[PDB]
């Protein structure tokens, strides 16, 4: 069973905004979905802080990088917290509505693009290099779900079964045609360098 949902029309115009405005400076994709997985990460640490059961489903919290240059995806795994089907479907867990009018307010104060993070709404800076996202999260509170969209104002959630995760979100990019730079070793070191230098959990960047 595959449901269909229709974005908030803020989120829409948000992401047929990054989709459509010229903006070379791509790569701070990956900062931000990194600096979600972080975020997530604190979250599932704190919380093991008072029960430690919480880490029955996986003791070590850290980010892997999957690139797949026949897939041709680049694809984000991190062990934090994970996130329940409503979350799923409430924009991911974001701030979207609120934090998308901050965003624009700021755009017309003199922000750019590479500011979308302050705002809560990194996410969808995915849109910069992927012609379609998949979210597949496991909190220790539901089962596992996978969120997807292609834009054009809609997205799905399906349950997802086959290969379980313990916990966590693994976000797929399925990159566009003209942007397979990002699965290079060397360019996703470079950035990981550039923008992620400092990051409390151990990012490994998987070989092909
Ligand atoms: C509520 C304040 O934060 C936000 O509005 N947005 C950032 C944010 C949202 C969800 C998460 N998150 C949680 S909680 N559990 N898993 C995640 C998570 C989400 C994403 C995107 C799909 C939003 C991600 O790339 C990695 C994650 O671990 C982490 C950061």
């Given at each position: 069973?595959?449901?269909?949902?229709?974005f908030q029309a803020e989120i829409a115009q948000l992401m047929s905004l990054i989709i459509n405005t010229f903006y070379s400076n791509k790569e701070i994709?990956?900062?931000?979905?990194?600096?979600?997985?972080?975020?997530?990460?604190?979250?599932?640490?704190?919380?093991?802080?008072?029960?430690?059961?919480?880490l029955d489903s996986g003791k070590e919290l850290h980010i892997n990088?999957?690139?797949?240059?026949?897939?041709?995806?680049?694809?984000?795994?991190?062990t934090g917290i994970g996130m329940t089907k409503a979350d799923l479907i409430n924009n991911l867990g974001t701030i979207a509505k609120?934090?998308?009018?901050?965003?624009?307010?700021?755009?017309?104060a003199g922000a750019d693009i590479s500011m979308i993070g302050q705002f809560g709404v990194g996410f969808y800076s995915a849109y910069l290099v992927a012609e379609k996202v998949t979210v597949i999260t496991k909190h220790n509170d539901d089962e596992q779900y996978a969120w997807e969209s292609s834009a054009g104002g809609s997205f799905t959630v399906r349950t997802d079964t086959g290969e379980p995760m313990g916990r966590g979100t693994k976000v797929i990019l399925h990159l566009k045609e003209d942007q397979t730079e990002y699965l290079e070793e060397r360019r996703i070191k470079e950035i990981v360098k550039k923008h992620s230098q400092f990051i409390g959990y151990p990012i490994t960047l998987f070989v092909e």
């Open positions: 069973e595959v449901e269909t949902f229709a994709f990956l900062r931000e979905l990194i600096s979600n997985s972080s975020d997530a990460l604190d979250k599932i640490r704190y919380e093991s802080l008072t029960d430690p059961s919480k990088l999957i690139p797949n240059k026949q897939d041709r995806t680049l694809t984000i795994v991190d609120s934090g998308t009018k901050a965003f624009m307010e700021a755009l017309q």
